[PDB]
Design a protein around this ligand. Structure first.
Ligand code: HEM
Ligand code: HEM
Lengths: 145, 145
């Protein structure tokens, strides 16, 4: 269950998640856009899903993409803030899951975000230990897809 | 015009929004649900739009409503954080506007949130002065609907 996946996040994992988010979460517009552009660069097959955003090659200049990227970073902010209360983490995770279920995004496809997250983390010197911690949070969302 | 509306956010208005947000934003779950239940209680004709959340009369006990409410407070958090940059404030407002346009929500009905906000603020000892400041921020979203 999603509850089982959340309830398993350990103190060491939450610690790594919070320490790293302190940095990558400080520049939501910059890191959010880089997050999306990297996804499009390494997984071109996903581009079609974001047709509403127009030409995503525009990057920062694309106001629709910029608005989306910033808002996505707040979804991650939401997750990070609910870490110490699985009950709340679960209800928010399930809320965003619906957003993706409606767009026919599978658990496997949603996991494609791990690559970009790993690279964004790396750009700030957060290694594999930190990439692994984030894959665990993403897995909580996958449990709901 | 969303850009003209954004221009209405003067230094004094931005200050009042931040000061009051520091209090209201400290308890997103509690104040978020309070906002929603007050809306449903004072404007029962809007409950139909929230069919997906189930029985909203259950308030806090309703997982979907709680997840929705917390997330809603993060939308307001997003707005507050974009106050320094008008271009970014507009792109996020337009992003959330689409979320409501697709649900057939007009500027007029979106404005029904002013009642709940004034009441939630009043219970925290923030009067009309602060209620009006928030009305201006809400007015920015209305301009995009
Ligand atoms: C860290 C992981 C991710 C987070 C936190 C996240 C968050 C969000 C949020 C907040 C929205 C806006 C929901 C709405 O207003 O309808 C969204 C939309 C969307 N997401 Fe994700 N997402 C993530 C990963 C992904 C991945 C990997 C894919 C695709 C493989 C994906 C596909 C979509 C699509 C198609 C939309 C709709 C975009 C639009 O038309 O506006 N998401 N996501
Ligand atoms: C302070 C003002 C408000 C803010 C910041 C706000 C924010 C949000 C957010 C973030 C969502 C989730 C978007 C999504 O995932 O699709 C949402 C959904 C929604 N909002 Fe609002 N909203 C506000 C006022 C209103 C009002 C006054 C109405 C109704 C008269 C309304 C009707 C809706 C509806 C129908 C949904 C869909 C809920 C669902 O089925 O999940 N909103 N809103």
């Amino acid at each position: 269950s999603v509850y089982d996946a959340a309830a398993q996040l350990t103190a060491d994992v939450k610690k790594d998640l919070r320490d790293s988010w302190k940095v990558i979460g400080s520049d939501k517009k910059g890191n959010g856009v880089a997050l999306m552009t990297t996804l499009f660069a390494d997984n071109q097959e996903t581009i079609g899903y974001f047709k509403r955003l127009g030409d995503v090659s525009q990057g920062m200049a694309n106001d629709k993409l910029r608005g989306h990227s910033i808002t996505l970073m707040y979804a991650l902010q939401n997750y990070i803030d609910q870490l110490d209360n699985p009950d709340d983490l679960v209800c928010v995770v399930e809320k965003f899951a619906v957003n993706h279920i409606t767009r026919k995004i599978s658990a496997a496809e949603f996991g494609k975000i791990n690559g970009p997250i790993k690279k964004v983390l790396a750009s700030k010197n957060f290694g594999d230990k930190y990439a692994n911690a984030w894959a665990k949070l993403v897995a909580v969302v996958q449990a709901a897809l």
